[PDB]
Amino acid sequence: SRVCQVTGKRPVTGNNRSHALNATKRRFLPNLHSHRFWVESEKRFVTLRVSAKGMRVIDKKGIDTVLAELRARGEKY
Amino acid sequence: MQVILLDKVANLGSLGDQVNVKAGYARNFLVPQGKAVPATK
Amino acid sequence: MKRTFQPSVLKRNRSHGFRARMATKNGRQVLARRRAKGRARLTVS
Amino acid sequence: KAXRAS
RNA sequence: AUGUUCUAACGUUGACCCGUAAUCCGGGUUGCGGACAGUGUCUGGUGGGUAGUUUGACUGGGGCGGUCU
RNA sequence: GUUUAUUAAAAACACAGCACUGUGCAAACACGAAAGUGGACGUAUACGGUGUGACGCCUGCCCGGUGCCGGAAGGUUAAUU
RNA sequence: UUUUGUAUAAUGGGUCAGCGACUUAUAUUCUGUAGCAAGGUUAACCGAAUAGGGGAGCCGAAGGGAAACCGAGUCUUAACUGGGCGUUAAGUUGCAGGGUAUAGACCCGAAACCCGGUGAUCUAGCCAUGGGCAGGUUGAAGGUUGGGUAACACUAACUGGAGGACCGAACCGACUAAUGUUGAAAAAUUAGCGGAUGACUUGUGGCUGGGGGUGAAAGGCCAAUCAAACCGGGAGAUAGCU
RNA sequence: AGGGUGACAGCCCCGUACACAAAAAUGCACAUGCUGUGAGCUCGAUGAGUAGGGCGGGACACGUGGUAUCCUGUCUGAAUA
RNA sequence: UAAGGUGAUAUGAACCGUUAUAACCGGCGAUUUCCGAAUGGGGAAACCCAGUGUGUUUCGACACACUAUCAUUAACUGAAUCCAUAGGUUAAUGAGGCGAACCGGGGGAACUGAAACAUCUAAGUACCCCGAGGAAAAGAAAUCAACCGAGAUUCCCCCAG
Ligand SMILES: [K+]
Ligand SMILES: [K+]
Ligand SMILES: [K+]
Ligand SMILES: [K+]
Ligand SMILES: [K+]
Ligand SMILES: [K+]
Ligand SMILES: [K+]
Ligand SMILES: [K+]
Ligand SMILES: [K+]
Ligand SMILES: [K+]
Ligand SMILES: [K+]
Ligand SMILES: [K+]
Ligand SMILES: [K+]
Ligand SMILES: [K+]
Ligand SMILES: [K+]
Ligand SMILES: [K+]
Ligand SMILES: [K+]
Ligand SMILES: [K+]
Ligand SMILES: [K+]
Ligand SMILES: [K+]
Ligand SMILES: [Mg+2]
Ligand SMILES: [Mg+2]
Ligand SMILES: [Mg+2]
Ligand SMILES: [Mg+2]
Ligand SMILES: [Mg+2]
Ligand SMILES: [Mg+2]
Ligand SMILES: [Mg+2]
Ligand SMILES: [Mg+2]
Ligand SMILES: [Mg+2]
Ligand SMILES: [Mg+2]
Ligand SMILES: [Mg+2]
Ligand SMILES: [Mg+2]
Ligand SMILES: [Mg+2]
Ligand SMILES: [Mg+2]
Ligand SMILES: [Mg+2]
Ligand SMILES: [Mg+2]
Ligand SMILES: [Mg+2]
Ligand SMILES: [Mg+2]
Ligand SMILES: [Mg+2]
Ligand SMILES: [Mg+2]
Ligand SMILES: [Mg+2]
Ligand SMILES: [Mg+2]
Ligand SMILES: [Mg+2]
Ligand SMILES: [Mg+2]
Ligand SMILES: [Mg+2]
Ligand SMILES: [Mg+2]
Ligand SMILES: [Mg+2]
Ligand SMILES: [Mg+2]
Ligand SMILES: [Mg+2]
Ligand SMILES: [Mg+2]
Ligand SMILES: [Mg+2]
Ligand SMILES: [Mg+2]
Ligand SMILES: [Mg+2]
Ligand SMILES: [Mg+2]
Ligand SMILES: [Mg+2]
Ligand SMILES: [Mg+2]
Ligand SMILES: [Mg+2]
Ligand SMILES: [Mg+2]
Ligand SMILES: [Mg+2]
Ligand SMILES: [Mg+2]
């Protein structure tokens, strides 16, 4: 599913609103990208499906912290 | 992305000096190759 | 004239039988509804 | 690729 | 801001190797593309493809014409 | 040949043939929130769409309108700033 | 019953029996009635307590002004001779009733719209795997042996057995007529009719699902239902109509 | 209370008021072991891709309105007593 | 607990019992086919077909137990690839399915009303989905208040149509 592995960002619903305020249901998808992260500890690339926001979280926290969080949730890589 | 260099990278700086790079440059090249570290401490 | 019901026990069981009902969540909901109503015959089986 | 054999 | 080159993101419905008794899939190697493509959010256009609807009243039947303060 | 099972079998539909048009292959196109799958285990002598409808003789004039195709100097013009 | 008007040849009722339509809750106003009265009354709750407690509130005893604000006045205006609204009229809480409001709101009745399911045992198309086509015709290409040519061409006989070919049963269909039309049958029977080696037909099984399928295209078909199936639900939709 | 009994029963029967009952299992409330569990004091420390922002939506009685506040798909991004 | 009793239609038969193993009632046990989550594989539910290990036999056979999946942990093993990792096997533990309402969450109509209709309404309703518990959720102020103060959450009556 379209779920960010780091943040848990997923499709959320909302409305398109026209100029005449017609509400039609829509979705807002996360900006997801499969990205190979270098993990120097494991000496390995780990592919994560990550939102762009999740990539900034990895930049800030470091991949090892984030992967440790994924292991505690039981979310797989 | 503020990084700290672990070698002399070309058109960046020598060992030890800390440079602001584009995050993609750090993420996808400098850090995997062992040319920079994220400015952590 | 050929009428609508042309019996085949194989097709009957494959279409509407117990295992066909159990195969999907909607089929299991049929069985749940029929049990709740107290049907003597849950399926064509 | 594919049910024919691939 | 554009042009060129590069490789490391990214693509690969090229090849090979392994998981493997599997062609799916994943990993690895290598080639080719390569910051393009593609996707997210936003945004202009297009959009009976689809949807919800509107499309007045008077009237010697209705319509047409005329009328409406 | 096909068709309105049950008031219409036809001059309607289809048809071989013809033409226009799209499509370079991860094809266009279609079914799919997607992955995929059909197209095709095909590859422009192929495939899709459209119209015409064996064959014969033929198929004139108009590009102003509406589309489509190409152009893009200039005018106008979104988010953004 | 409906109407200007019905013996009306307008509507409804075969008859009987049973059932079948102005309700309920809450709010609000008016009337009646009862209590208390410039007051009236409590809600939740506490209480085994229809008691008792609980006065949080609510309504009323003051209005005027958009408002600040002023106040038996006030607003208007720079200011009223004035002028508007007020002051010189008892309320409140039960109980019963009339009306109103929100609710299905007197009962029954749409065509429809939406949501989730069930259906390709009928039929449409396709897929896989099996089966069917009596009997009789016509005589394509090709072949061979002669002829003919420089070689081909071309030509005769013999052979050959093509075809959405021909005639015609099974089989598939459905052009005409009659019958039947509370049928023998919710589409048939009888006599004729078309196709009948094919774009044929048929058995078994499979796949496609409802704004969806499938369609040699008739809006055809998708279980006797189709310009949007069926079942259940939103649901007592709504009904200025009968 | 109520029911039954050949019609309507305090006194016919079964009950009812009331008073009693558990070998065994088990709910609960306590008392008390065992095994984890750590109270208390001083010293601190004080939740960052977060708050906030831009864009799009949604939620708040509050329909973008002069619109605070909350949530966040997207792009950003503090101060931290 | 007992002088009766072997459930019903429902008699009858053949019995059982009367001072306590008749029957009846309650506690705890035993047995508890097959299908069904269904779990050894399959399947048109109530059927078809196995593997493995033990034990037994009259060599024809018989009996018994185990063998699903996923998650977690452990052990052992083990690619490309050298370490390693992926992968593999085995063990233990747990899960799975069902259930009327209530509850939290993910999605989410339309009829209808507006005397038409699109904003708006209906309504975050119906419905679908996921998850839980005996309740759930919420909850211990980056809350209100108004210069006075209150002191988490929840629910009821007011405030107030
Ligand atoms: K590559
Ligand atoms: K790009
Ligand atoms: K359109
Ligand atoms: K007139
Ligand atoms: K007239
Ligand atoms: K015909
Ligand atoms: K033109
Ligand atoms: K009349
Ligand atoms: K009449
Ligand atoms: K009243
Ligand atoms: K009164
Ligand atoms: K006055
Ligand atoms: K009174
Ligand atoms: K109504
Ligand atoms: K009413
Ligand atoms: K439909
Ligand atoms: K009695
Ligand atoms: K933010
Ligand atoms: K509407
Ligand atoms: K209306
Ligand atoms: Mg339309
Ligand atoms: Mg509507
Ligand atoms: Mg209309
Ligand atoms: Mg008119
Ligand atoms: Mg014909
Ligand atoms: Mg017809
Ligand atoms: Mg006809
Ligand atoms: Mg393809
Ligand atoms: Mg034509
Ligand atoms: Mg012409
Ligand atoms: Mg009349
Ligand atoms: Mg008269
Ligand atoms: Mg008359
Ligand atoms: Mg009459
Ligand atoms: Mg008469
Ligand atoms: Mg009438
Ligand atoms: Mg009548
Ligand atoms: Mg006043
Ligand atoms: Mg023929
Ligand atoms: Mg036909
Ligand atoms: Mg006939
Ligand atoms: Mg013929
Ligand atoms: Mg014939
Ligand atoms: Mg028509
Ligand atoms: Mg039909
Ligand atoms: Mg419709
Ligand atoms: Mg409704
Ligand atoms: Mg109705
Ligand atoms: Mg009597
Ligand atoms: Mg803090
Ligand atoms: Mg804030
Ligand atoms: Mg924010
Ligand atoms: Mg703001
Ligand atoms: Mg908003
Ligand atoms: Mg099984
Ligand atoms: Mg089994
Ligand atoms: Mg469970
Ligand atoms: Mg309306
Ligand atoms: Mg809780
Ligand atoms: Mg203070």
XYZ file of N, CA, C and O (backbone and C1' of nucleotides) in Angstrom, chain G residues 45 63 71 76-78 81 92 114 118-119 126 132 164 173 175 187 198 203 209 213 223 236:
161
model
P -31.679 12.321 37.314
O -30.933 12.465 38.721
C -29.507 12.695 38.771
C -29.156 13.419 40.049
C -29.579 12.746 41.359
O -28.619 11.764 41.720
C -30.204 15.030 41.409
P -40.180 45.529 29.622
O -40.506 46.647 28.530
C -41.694 47.461 28.692
C -41.356 48.921 28.502
C -40.497 49.297 27.294
O -41.293 49.358 26.126
C -39.702 50.428 29.197
P -31.428 57.938 34.789
O -32.870 57.285 34.598
C -33.934 58.088 34.057
C -35.110 57.208 33.720
C -35.644 56.329 34.850
O -36.589 57.078 35.588
C -35.315 55.007 32.922
P -31.369 58.805 19.659
O -32.336 59.528 18.613
C -32.761 58.837 17.408
C -33.862 59.625 16.736
C -33.566 61.100 16.441
O -32.910 61.229 15.195
C -35.704 60.903 17.442
P -31.332 61.492 15.096
O -31.262 63.081 15.219
C -31.876 63.888 14.189
C -32.267 65.221 14.769
C -31.200 65.960 15.582
O -30.254 66.572 14.720
C -33.295 66.102 16.676
P -28.728 66.789 15.168
O -28.894 67.837 16.365
C -27.735 68.145 17.191
C -28.002 69.364 18.044
C -29.346 69.424 18.782
O -29.255 68.771 20.039
C -29.027 71.432 17.580
P -41.113 71.697 23.481
O -42.151 72.174 22.354
C -43.454 71.531 22.240
C -44.446 72.451 21.570
C -45.732 71.780 21.078
O -46.523 71.304 22.161
C -45.013 73.312 19.467
P -46.668 34.820 32.968
O -46.334 33.641 33.987
C -45.168 33.719 34.824
C -45.320 32.723 35.937
C -45.610 31.287 35.496
O -44.370 30.663 35.209
C -47.119 31.939 37.205
P -28.117 6.248 -8.657
O -27.742 6.109 -7.122
C -27.012 7.164 -6.470
C -26.921 6.821 -5.006
C -26.265 5.482 -4.666
O -24.856 5.597 -4.676
C -28.268 5.685 -3.457
P -22.063 -12.162 -2.863
O -23.426 -12.624 -3.541
C -24.383 -13.377 -2.777
C -25.563 -13.670 -3.664
C -25.256 -14.332 -5.009
O -25.228 -15.733 -4.832
C -26.671 -12.485 -5.364
P -24.426 -16.663 -5.860
O -25.430 -16.583 -7.100
C -24.876 -16.443 -8.429
C -25.977 -16.125 -9.404
C -25.517 -16.035 -10.858
O -25.459 -17.345 -11.392
C -26.811 -14.141 -10.340
P -17.691 -15.765 -30.280
O -16.408 -15.997 -29.360
C -15.378 -14.988 -29.270
C -14.668 -15.167 -27.955
C -14.084 -16.556 -27.677
O -12.865 -16.709 -28.378
C -15.226 -15.818 -25.769
P -19.212 -38.113 -34.415
O -20.493 -37.212 -34.714
C -21.824 -37.668 -34.362
C -22.818 -36.693 -34.942
C -22.729 -36.503 -36.457
O -23.419 -37.585 -37.067
C -22.829 -34.390 -35.412
P -16.599 -20.775 -51.095
O -17.914 -20.808 -50.186
C -18.042 -21.826 -49.186
C -18.795 -21.268 -48.013
C -20.166 -20.655 -48.280
O -21.113 -21.690 -48.487
C -18.953 -19.525 -46.549
P -32.072 -23.517 -33.142
O -32.707 -22.698 -34.360
C -32.159 -21.415 -34.692
C -32.503 -21.059 -36.116
C -33.817 -20.315 -36.342
O -33.623 -18.942 -36.060
C -33.461 -21.943 -38.039
P -38.888 -14.878 -39.643
O -39.493 -15.074 -41.103
C -39.269 -14.069 -42.101
C -40.122 -14.354 -43.314
C -41.597 -14.686 -43.065
O -42.356 -13.490 -43.015
C -40.640 -16.368 -44.416
P -44.458 -19.850 -23.657
O -44.400 -19.768 -25.244
C -45.346 -20.520 -26.027
C -45.257 -20.041 -27.451
C -43.839 -19.947 -28.034
O -43.864 -20.255 -29.414
C -44.848 -17.843 -28.104
P -18.862 -25.461 -47.808
O -19.252 -24.439 -46.652
C -18.289 -24.152 -45.628
C -18.992 -23.367 -44.558
C -18.073 -22.706 -43.537
O -17.729 -21.451 -44.074
C -19.678 -23.994 -42.408
P -25.995 -28.042 -26.477
O -25.129 -29.252 -25.907
C -25.794 -30.489 -25.589
C -24.787 -31.449 -25.011
C -24.024 -30.971 -23.776
O -24.830 -31.084 -22.613
C -22.521 -31.956 -25.292
P -16.636 -9.095 -14.293
O -18.200 -9.038 -14.617
C -18.737 -8.009 -15.488
C -19.915 -7.384 -14.793
C -19.638 -6.930 -13.354
O -20.354 -5.765 -13.009
C -21.301 -8.578 -13.341
P -18.342 -2.723 -19.582
O -18.686 -4.283 -19.655
C -17.858 -5.237 -18.956
C -18.570 -6.567 -18.923
C -18.841 -7.214 -20.282
O -17.709 -7.981 -20.639
C -20.820 -7.237 -19.010
P -30.773 -12.415 -15.987
O -31.617 -13.760 -16.043
C -32.275 -14.145 -17.262
C -33.178 -15.308 -16.956
C -34.074 -15.144 -15.726
O -35.265 -15.879 -15.918
C -32.541 -16.896 -15.352
P -39.368 1.254 6.540
O -40.465 2.357 6.169
C -41.125 2.312 4.883
C -41.864 3.609 4.655
C -41.013 4.887 4.628
O -41.627 5.846 3.786
C -42.528 5.041 6.391
